[PDB]
Amino acid sequence: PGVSVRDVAAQDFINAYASFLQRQGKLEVPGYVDIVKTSSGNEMPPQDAEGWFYKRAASVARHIYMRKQVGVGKLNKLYGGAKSRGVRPYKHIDASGSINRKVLQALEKIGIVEISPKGGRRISENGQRDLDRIAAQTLEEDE
Amino acid sequence: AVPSVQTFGKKKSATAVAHVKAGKGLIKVNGSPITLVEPEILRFKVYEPLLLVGLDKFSNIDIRVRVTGGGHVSQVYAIRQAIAKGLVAYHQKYVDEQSKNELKKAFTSYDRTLLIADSRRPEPKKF
Amino acid sequence: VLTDQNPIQVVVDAITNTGPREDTTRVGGGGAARRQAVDVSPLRRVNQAIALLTIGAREAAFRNIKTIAETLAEELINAAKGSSTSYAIKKKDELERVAKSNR
Amino acid sequence: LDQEKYDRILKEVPTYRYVSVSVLVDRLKIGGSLARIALRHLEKEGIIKPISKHSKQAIYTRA
Amino acid sequence: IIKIRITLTSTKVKQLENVSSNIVKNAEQHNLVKKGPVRLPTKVLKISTRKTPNGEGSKTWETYEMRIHKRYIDLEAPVQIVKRITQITIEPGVDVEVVVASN
Amino acid sequence: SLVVQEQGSFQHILRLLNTNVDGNIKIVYALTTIKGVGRRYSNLVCKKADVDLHKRAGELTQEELERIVQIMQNPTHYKIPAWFLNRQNDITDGKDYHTLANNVESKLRDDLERLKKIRAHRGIRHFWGLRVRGQ
Amino acid sequence: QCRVCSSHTGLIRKYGLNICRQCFREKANDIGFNKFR
Amino acid sequence: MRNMIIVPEMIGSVVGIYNGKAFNQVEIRPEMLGHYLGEFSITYTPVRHGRAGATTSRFIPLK
Amino acid sequence: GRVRTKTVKRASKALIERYYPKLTLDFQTNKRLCDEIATIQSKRLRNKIAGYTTHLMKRIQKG
RNA sequence: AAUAGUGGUGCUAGCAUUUGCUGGUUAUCCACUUCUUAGAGGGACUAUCGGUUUCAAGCCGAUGGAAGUUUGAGGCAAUAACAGGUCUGUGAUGCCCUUAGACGUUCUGGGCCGCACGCGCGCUACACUGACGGAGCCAGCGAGUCUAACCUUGGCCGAGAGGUCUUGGUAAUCUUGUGAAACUCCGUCGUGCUGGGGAUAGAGCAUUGUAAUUAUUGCUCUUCAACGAGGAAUUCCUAGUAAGCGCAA
């Protein structure tokens, strides 16, 4: 009768969590969120005007769950697209770093994820008793 | 100690090891329940080894499988190769052979490639 | 949901009509580009039966608002009966009609 | 810009067999989002008996 | 009296199973502690070059190959036991190395 | 969602510096019909306009048509960075401005004609291309 | 370098041997390269 | 000659002597500022069509 | 797509002439035999040579 | 088999908790080879039955089998007029100036790079089986630094592009699980050459070297121009094959 993080939905679990984070408002949201898109390869700032900053910040916590450590180079090489070059053939996307640098630092203020001695930023017992516990709060969304 | 065996299933360079244990019956695909695999259309292909013999023989089992390699399509085929041949190792080490062959006949009447993996490797070009 | 009883039934009867009973030949004739007496094998018959139903749906769903699934709905129930109102039918028919001439 | 989105839809909904985006674009004024928001309003109205739905398309019929 | 490690990375596979046998032979006549010869995945070299001196003619190419095999053994012995036997297992084309890494 | 039925009041012709807009579209696509402004530029100014992002012409408040050019004519006043502009660090005055529809041809000919005839501050072998092969 | 056989181009810069490839086919044996497939 | 930036220390000076064969006649005009000293000399004569009535090339051939 | 070359064909009837009482209609036995009474260089050539002798040997039980 | 991996015993965190399901890492220690890698061998012969044929060579079905198209793919194998085979080939040609050489260098701008049509072997199209935006997230063969600048992860600033502080890696250990793309759900969009398609362009910031104008390349914002499936014709590519999709040397 007790779950881990591993036995919930994938897309839906972020949605219920970030909407709770939408009620929180405890995020250092910088001024240039209106202008700067996610990478260079994308064409437009997203159709979400507000909750996209809640979206990426939720899922980066979701990805360090199963993992040991995450630096910043990894989630650069992650984020789901293909660079168009015009009339020349395509190439893989690489993501921007400034929009990921602060949002990784934006969870140290709330006790989630911190630097491992091996060299990456990882969850400890701060999230391991709370982030699972609010993932356990997503079990109410299962019914 | 506990009755425990290992099997594995391959398709197009994609492996799927299996660990069999004994218990209430948990089927773990790489650390997750089996009812959550992302090619949602192919969700019932993994149900096929379970939905051939009835839901009976599993209150004494435990199944943990993990995969590597391949794409998002072959790994669906790889897991049901090791799972279906994983059940017979109980019935070829512990339970008798008349219980073995009745599901052996039940599988290979329906799918020859549930027991025996394919043999269709790729090919080098302009050489 | 389009007023019937079995969704797998609506295609297995449909290919009964669209297996062309007669045929032309695929030859000129040696200068006199003619068409002679010929019939079709059944295992060849089913092959071209299904395929001409399919290819009509692409242009039926090319560049218009309706989707593919909306085409395949109306096409097969058109193909379910002898109507010759669908392109899946009204190109196999005129093949068979000139085959009733030539021979 | 008041009646054309008021009588052919709020009254003449249950006349058909099923409902998709094909019937709603039979007017050349009801655009893509306009036809989309029609079922999006009508699912609240309960006339839609749903069958299957995903992001590319739904399968909807009336009550 | 120190744990050592020997490597040998050669390219004549017939002349590497004689050497790796007599390594484990005279150690086991003195019965030291050991772990078996672990055989690594081999390395292949290749270079595609087309097959003409000039350029005038049809086009496909060559492909050349060279195979490197490498295996290594860990060992512990008194130094007087090992410092003699590593000097009587010489053979041309064969490389021998000693590593006493005990960090 | 719902059925909102407004009394028409929609303008097939607009008047924003000789720009007549078929405003039965999204307003960020409405501004792109002018020159010098595209969807990479018009994206933020409607987000700067703080309105609904789905409206047509028949529902716009009348002050906002003044407002949208007011943010346009005062670009750096309301937090537009340097990398969000067309004309930047000019050869005549060094300042940085953006351009409307009917004046992209301004700062165009005079800035090319110096490279065309006068053998200008840089244009002495950039002197025949838009003249002999691409005039 | 231009090594020998009317070549300063098409050099094999890989593996640090630096041979003109006209004069590689006749020297690839005794280096210990051989073709097999 | 071809490589340096222009200096403010110039008035009308006819820079350029021989330094090869393609001559570099560089008079100064009066003060058009911020550029290389390379964009003046001979590099290609702009000869139009001598017999270019086969403009680029032919069509698919047939005789 | 598979007929047997004469060096299979010829040596298959030389072996049947010197050791006929020793041979046997089953292939798996006399697979182990040709290495004893003859010298076969490869392994696949042995498998082909003993393959057709047994096929030859059942002719003897009819003609 | 600490240069692969699981299986426990632990230190150890969650834990619905309550037996429990996920973690925990150097060394907590022991026991293991199924998966992994590489040596030694084995295994397929068209086997066994049924047809068919001068009953011959064989060819078709059948059930077994990892495998039944020479089992899949390559390497290797000489008769001949292309006076293209030339390396300090020598011609083992006597005129090329063949010795103020028109063969060197440093030290110089100009070689493939000029308007109006291609037989140049597909590239980016012509769209809702689609774009755009959110997510979900899977691989294979290859490569690399000392007389010296090769790979590059964290922490760094910045919108990219990059810059700075560090390391790690002479090689299954490090980069690297090379988190590749198509595809995959949830959305926005609505058939008009519109948000499909960006072909010529002007304004800018960066890097690499002795030096980028005639844009060497790369990121900004603008501009969006031929282009509605192609006349007569005619094709490097064979069942995990044809086609898309890669982005490794």
Swiss-Prot record, chain B:
Its main location: cytoplasm. The modification Phosphothreonine is found at residue 68. There is a cross-link at residues 28, 45, 57 (Glycyl lysine isopeptide (Lys-Gly) (interchain with G-Cter in ubiquitin)). GO terms for biological process: maturation of SSU-rRNA from tricistronic rRNA transcript (SSU-rRNA, 5.8S rRNA, LSU-rRNA); translational initiation. GO terms for cellular component: 90S preribosome; cytosol; cytosolic small ribosomal subunit. Belongs to the universal ribosomal protein uS9 family. InterPro entries: Ribosomal_Su5_D2-typ_SF, Ribosomal_uS9, Ribosomal_uS9_CS, Ribsml_uS5_D2-typ_fold_subgr. Coiled coil: none annotated. This is Small ribosomal subunit protein uS9A. Component of the ribosome, a large ribonucleoprotein complex responsible for the synthesis of proteins in the cell. The small ribosomal subunit (SSU) binds messenger RNAs (mRNAs) and translates the encoded message by selecting cognate aminoacyl-transfer RNA (tRNA) molecules. The large subunit (LSU) contains the ribosomal catalytic site termed the peptidyl transferase center (PTC), which catalyzes the formation of peptide bonds, thereby polymerizing the amino acids delivered by tRNAs into a polypeptide chain. Present with 33800 molecules/cell in log phase SD medium. It comes from Saccharomyces cerevisiae (strain ATCC 204508 / S288c). It holds the Pfam family Ribosomal_S9. It is found in: Cytoplasm. Keywords: Acetylation, Cytoplasm, Isopeptide bond, Phosphoprotein, Ribonucleoprotein, Ribosomal protein, Ubl conjugation. GO terms for molecular function: RNA binding; structural constituent of ribosome.
From Swiss-Prot, chain D:
This is Small ribosomal subunit protein eS25A. It is presumed that the precursor part of S25 is engaged in assembling of the small subunit, thus being essential in ribosome maturation. Present with 322000 molecules/cell in log phase SD medium. Its main location: cytoplasm. It comes from the Eukaryota. GO terms for biological process: cytoplasmic translation. Component of the small ribosomal subunit (SSU). Mature yeast ribosomes consist of a small (40S) and a large (60S) subunit. The 40S small subunit contains 1 molecule of ribosomal RNA (18S rRNA) and 33 different proteins (encoded by 57 genes). The large 60S subunit contains 3 rRNA molecules (25S, 5.8S and 5S rRNA) and 46 different proteins (encoded by 81 genes). Belongs to the eukaryotic ribosomal protein eS25 family. Keywords: Cytoplasm, Methylation, Ribonucleoprotein, Ribosomal protein.
UniProtKB/Swiss-Prot annotation, chain E:
The keyword Ubl conjugation applies. Signal peptide: none annotated. Disulfide bonds: none annotated. GO terms for molecular function: mRNA binding; structural constituent of ribosome. There is a cross-link at residues 3, 14, 83 (Glycyl lysine isopeptide (Lys-Gly) (interchain with G-Cter in ubiquitin)). It holds the Pfam family Ribosomal_S10. Coiled coil: none annotated. The keyword NAD does not apply. N-terminally acetylated by acetyltransferase NatA. Also partially acetylated by NatC. GO terms for cellular component: cytoplasm; cytosol; cytosolic small ribosomal subunit. PANTHER family: 30S RIBOSOMAL PROTEIN S10 FAMILY MEMBER (PTHR11700). This is Small ribosomal subunit protein uS10. The gene is RPS20.
From Swiss-Prot, chain G:
GO terms for cellular component: cytosol; cytosolic small ribosomal subunit. Binds 1 zinc ion per subunit. The keyword Lyase does not apply. The modification Phosphoserine is found at residue 6. Its main location: cytoplasm. It comes from the Eukaryota. One of its GO terms (biological process) is cytoplasmic translation. One of its GO terms (molecular function) is zinc ion binding. Keywords: Cytoplasm, Metal-binding, Phosphoprotein, Ribonucleoprotein, Ribosomal protein, Zinc. Its cofactor is Zn(2+). Present with 6490 molecules/cell in log phase SD medium. Belongs to the universal ribosomal protein uS14 family. Component of the ribosome, a large ribonucleoprotein complex responsible for the synthesis of proteins in the cell. The small ribosomal subunit (SSU) binds messenger RNAs (mRNAs) and translates the encoded message by selecting cognate aminoacyl-transfer RNA (tRNA) molecules. The large subunit (LSU) contains the ribosomal catalytic site termed the peptidyl transferase center (PTC), which catalyzes the formation of peptide bonds, thereby polymerizing the amino acids delivered by tRNAs into a polypeptide chain. This is Small ribosomal subunit protein uS14A. It comes from Saccharomyces cerevisiae (strain ATCC 204508 / S288c) (Baker's yeast). The lineage of its organism: Eukaryota, Fungi, Dikarya, Ascomycota, Saccharomycotina. The chain holds residues 20 to 56 of 56 of the full protein.
